[PDB]
Design a protein around this motif. Sequence first.
Motif, mmCIF file in Angstrom:
data_model
loop_
_atom_site.group_PDB
_atom_site.id
_atom_site.type_symbol
_atom_site.label_atom_id
_atom_site.label_comp_id
_atom_site.label_asym_id
_atom_site.label_seq_id
_atom_site.Cartn_x
_atom_site.Cartn_y
_atom_site.Cartn_z
ATOM 1 N N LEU A 85 0.822 -1.200 0.000
ATOM 2 C CA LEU A 85 0.000 0.000 0.000
ATOM 3 C C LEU A 85 0.860 1.255 0.000
ATOM 4 N N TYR B 291 -1.705 5.612 2.976
ATOM 5 C CA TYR B 291 -2.055 4.751 4.098
ATOM 6 C C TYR B 291 -1.031 4.793 5.225
ATOM 7 N N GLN C 145 2.271 0.697 6.784
ATOM 8 C CA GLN C 145 1.422 -0.486 6.873
ATOM 9 C C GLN C 145 2.218 -1.740 7.204
ATOM 10 N N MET D 136 -7.935 -3.222 3.491
ATOM 11 C CA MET D 136 -7.627 -1.903 4.049
ATOM 12 C C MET D 136 -8.170 -0.753 3.207
ATOM 13 N N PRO D 137 -8.158 -0.803 1.872
ATOM 14 C CA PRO D 137 -8.723 0.315 1.097
ATOM 15 C C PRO D 137 -10.214 0.499 1.286
ATOM 16 N N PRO E 291 -7.434 1.697 9.397
ATOM 17 C CA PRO E 291 -6.722 2.810 8.763
ATOM 18 C C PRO E 291 -6.608 3.992 9.710
ATOM 19 N N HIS E 292 -5.612 4.836 9.431
ATOM 20 C CA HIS E 292 -5.313 6.060 10.190
ATOM 21 C C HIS E 292 -6.394 6.458 11.197
ATOM 22 N N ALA F 71 -1.309 3.216 10.279
ATOM 23 C CA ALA F 71 -2.471 2.427 10.685
ATOM 24 C C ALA F 71 -2.463 2.135 12.183
#
Length: 819
Positions: free
Chosen positions: A358, A363, A366, A401-402, A440-441, A442
């Motif tokens: 990523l 991101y 990660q 994750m996306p 995520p925001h 990781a």
Amino acid sequence: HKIKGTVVLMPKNELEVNLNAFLGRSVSLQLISATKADAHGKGKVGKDTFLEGINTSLPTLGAGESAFNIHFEWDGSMGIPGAFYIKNYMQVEFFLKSLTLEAISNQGTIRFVCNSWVYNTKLYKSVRIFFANHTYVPSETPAPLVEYREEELKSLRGNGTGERKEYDRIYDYDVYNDLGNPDKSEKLARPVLGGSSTFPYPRRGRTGRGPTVTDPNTEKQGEVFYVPRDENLGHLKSKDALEIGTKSLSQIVQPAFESAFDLKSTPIEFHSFQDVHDLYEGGIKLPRDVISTIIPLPVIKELYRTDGQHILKFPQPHVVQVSQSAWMTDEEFAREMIAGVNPCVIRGLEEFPPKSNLDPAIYGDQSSKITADSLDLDGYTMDEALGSRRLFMLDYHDIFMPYVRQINQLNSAKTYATRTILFLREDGTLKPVAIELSLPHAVSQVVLPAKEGVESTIWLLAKAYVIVNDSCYHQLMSHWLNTHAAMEPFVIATHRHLSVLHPIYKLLTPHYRNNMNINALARQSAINANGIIETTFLPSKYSVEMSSAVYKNWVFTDQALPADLIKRGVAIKDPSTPHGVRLLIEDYPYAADGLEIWAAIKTWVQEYVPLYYARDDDVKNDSELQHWWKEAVEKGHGDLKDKPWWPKLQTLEDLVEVCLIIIWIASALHAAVNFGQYPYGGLIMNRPTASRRLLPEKGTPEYEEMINNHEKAYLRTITSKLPTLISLSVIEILSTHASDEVYLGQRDNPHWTSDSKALQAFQKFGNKLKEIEEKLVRRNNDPSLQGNRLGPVQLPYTLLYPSSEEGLTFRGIPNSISI
Ligand SMILES: [Fe+2]
């Protein structure tokens, strides 16, 4: 000068979910010469000839069939027939099976295998034509039949316009622009999948209903999703029409269930594990209205036991039949990654820690937060475990994750992106040794195994989050994307560009049976906006879109089983072994049995192909084959047409490997990922479809509940009761073999070709499959393999046994993606 023939046909009523009407001038056949041509080079046509009488003294007739005698007048000028026209003057369509001609030609008999619905002749633009069962590559077609052959292909392609009707036999492509319903609500709008770099996707069969008023890119809804008529399979028994069950579940059963819950007649949630087990023990009590909607419906009524008034009862899933608690073991959790419903994702780990691809500029960092020193590798160091190739992983981090942020904004979804690390113990089984739960925001939490205290409950929940990731990946990518959706472009291209005469048509098409049919019902009911998947699985409206993101990385040549095993790092290339690969998980059941099936299919294809192609130039010079493959890539999988890995189809080897991969996908790969769904997933705790909350934080009621009532904590985290009832019902359908299934090693007609060498090669293939089955039986009775082949649930791995009876059997490999 009379030729005796016998027509075999089934009237419509035998296949829906008076015979003397066929006589008189009701149905005419005209013979077409293969050896004598008219002025323009076309085979001479015979006179209209009508059915003469009902043949009741024919022994070989099957159920729902009737044989008619006929006598053609065919003098010496007419040569030898190789085709025929048929015209139905009746108002009702009928299904034609065959024509047999007696005492004609140097072979004594001529057979025509038809298997087609014949509608009123006024409904067709050109007369229906059928060919004898002699196979011809294009350059070997008898000259008087060349134009017939090409014209019939022209007819099957259509012109790319118009709304398709139920009697059209027109095969063309369209994008997945039919799943959203923006004219009903902007909330039901969905992205078009296919035709862009943002959302690449395989094509599906064109239906042509026309655009919605709110979005000219999206196709208007309809009551019936068209498939070319012969793909719309009828069935002698209504209970075999499994494909229509998902439609009835969405339109009729689901609303009835929802009404019983809205009424608060039943409790809305499970409260203990026993409430779930009750579903197949005593059953659930529902209002009479809701029961009376179920019991008369075809297909639906077979899914449940009932007293006809209030009680509904599900069948007991295999996974619990021997032990009720064994699903909770770390042993079973790991074992199902190589012997469960989704056995084909686990990867080898060659470095530690695992890394993400990523973009950190989006991101952030990660990189995995699992530390080597925290793992209990049974005394091994990390260096030794990596060096011996004993470290593996199930990694859903970069895929999920996306989407985690979007998913977690939904009202009743919460998910982590997960990684699971697995160690191959010295007894040959896998040991899970860590789970990483990422947001995520990781933000990452590492969870280690524990059998005591609250930490054990946290570990149990961690496993549930992993399996929610795995259930969505299994259904939408392993199952829906890789089999159903990937195959349909090849079905379309085959009918558009390979004649019924063609050797590769006959080799391939049995493995397409029902594919388009089930997919069209699925677009209408299963993966549509607010349909079955969006309501029962975690990602809701993002479900199908996620599969487009994975398709970006789909590689046709990595679908070959040996290539898949090497790409995932669970095997290495080794020419000394029987199959050319050595498994790094020795007993890996899906892969070990699969290699035996793969090799049998390979032997069959490599034997059949040389009967019709002698050298590489014969493949190059087959214009139907070349157009077929060109269109399958450039149109059917057109969003990937510029990838370098597509075979070129210039060699015998190319053709072999293309046909082998197609047959593998349609038969054994699909079977392995499909027919275990209810056996493993019919207990919702073992295969949750959704998660609904994140881990509780210390000091909250939810954390204390976790301490005092781990069963409630688990059930609050996974799929709710109402979507569970709907999901269990769907996977029960999908896990059932219809009684008219055609399995690998079998064909629906013994006369599909006049070529005795092809028939002998096919008999050899069937005999090999029987030998393989005996080998798999012995594997499941080998005590040294019980750790992975049976596990704590004591369930023998039978999903790659080639044969099966009807029902929910956890075995049997169909020819095709038939459900
Ligand atoms: Fe399927």
